[PDB]
Amino acid sequence: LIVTQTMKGLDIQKVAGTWYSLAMAASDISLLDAQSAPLRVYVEELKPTPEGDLEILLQKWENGECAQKKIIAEKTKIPAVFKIDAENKVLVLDTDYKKYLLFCMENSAEQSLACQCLVRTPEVDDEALEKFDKALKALPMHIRLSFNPTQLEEQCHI
Amino acid sequence: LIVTQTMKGLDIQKVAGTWYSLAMAASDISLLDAQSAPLRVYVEELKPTPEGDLEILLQKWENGECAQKKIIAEKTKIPAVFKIDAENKVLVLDTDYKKYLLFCMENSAEQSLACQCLVRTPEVDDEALEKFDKALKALPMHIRLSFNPTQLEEQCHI
Numbered sequence A, B: 001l002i003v004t005q006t007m008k009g010l011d012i013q014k015v016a017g018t019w020y021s022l023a024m025a026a027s028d029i030s031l032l033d034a035q036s037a038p039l040r041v042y043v044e045e046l047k048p049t050p051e052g053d054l055e056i057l058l059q060k061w062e063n064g065e066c067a068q069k070k071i072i073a074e075k076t077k078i079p080a081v082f083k084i085d086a087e088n089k090v091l092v093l094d095t096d097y098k099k100y101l102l103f104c105m106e107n108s109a110e111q112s113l114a115c116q117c118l119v120r121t122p123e124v125d126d127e128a129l130e131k132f133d134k135a136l137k138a139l140p141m142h143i144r145l146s147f148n149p150t151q152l153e154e155q156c157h158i
């Protein structure tokens, strides 16, 4: 239960659409170190279901190539928290729907933790990056990556 | 000439001895991404020469093993700036000699840039890490790593 920042008033339907993983951080280096690392995933689109589950389109480098993944985060009794089917919960820390979204993924244990700053456009948002860094300043992150606009328009951010 | 933080009054003899690379950052992900990445070096000891050159003992992972390296930074007319023989200049941004040292290495071009927060002891110094983050906040860093006390007592921080 390491993360104690959640979005109050979250309307999950309003996060539907295109996002860019501007920045990522994790608790352990190995979670993001290699391009095939377990939590180095690049968000493409969020597709909230009518009953409040969250289908996720993303890219991940596997076996020497940029692969497409589709996964579903199921709703919980808490609007800002979803569970991935594999126990790994996803939490929405903050979002303004129109520009940025900060979320973390953590495992039930440790804990193991990865967070991203998502943005709507392939641009460096300094002010979403500051909110991201503010949110993680107490979290025990040991790796942090960010991407430039060119990489953001590339599959797997090459 | 991207870095415009240098230590005034630097006495290079007083940086001799044992250091730990508590944290590292770089301008491009690939400079630190892999464990065999070009700038993922782990400082061991600094050995200032009598005439002001700076011999450096460090570790770097090469060809599937933690290798020992010994390199020399030659003095320039500027006390806080040394050149490595290979044009890559090293700059000392700040140090209190007894606890922390911040430096950057950059190539003549880009520029390509790597900085570290060095510390005397295998401990997380939050206040040297804040000075490190403050010094890099305007620099265009896209990867950032930090190590825990256990890793700090391991060769190549395993």
Ligand SMILES: CCCCC/C=C\C/C=C\CCCCCCCC(=O)O
Pocket (backbone or CB within 6 Å): A015, A038, A039, A041, A043, A046, A056, A058, A060, A069, A071, A084, A090, A092, A103, A105
């Ligand atoms: C509200 C926004 C939420 C966005 C959530 C984004 C990603 C979901 C979290 C983690 C996904 C785990 C890694 C990808 C799994 C694919 C299988 C694998 O290769 O291991």
Ligand SMILES: CCCCC/C=C\C/C=C\CCCCCCCC(=O)O
Pocket (backbone or CB within 6 Å): B015, B038, B039, B041, B043, B046, B056, B058, B060, B069, B071, B084, B090, B092, B103, B105
């Ligand atoms: C005042 C403290 C200065 C400390 C300087 C530390 C390191 C020097 C900077 C860069 C070293 C380049 C990478 C190692 C070179 C070995 C050859 C290689 O494998 O490419």
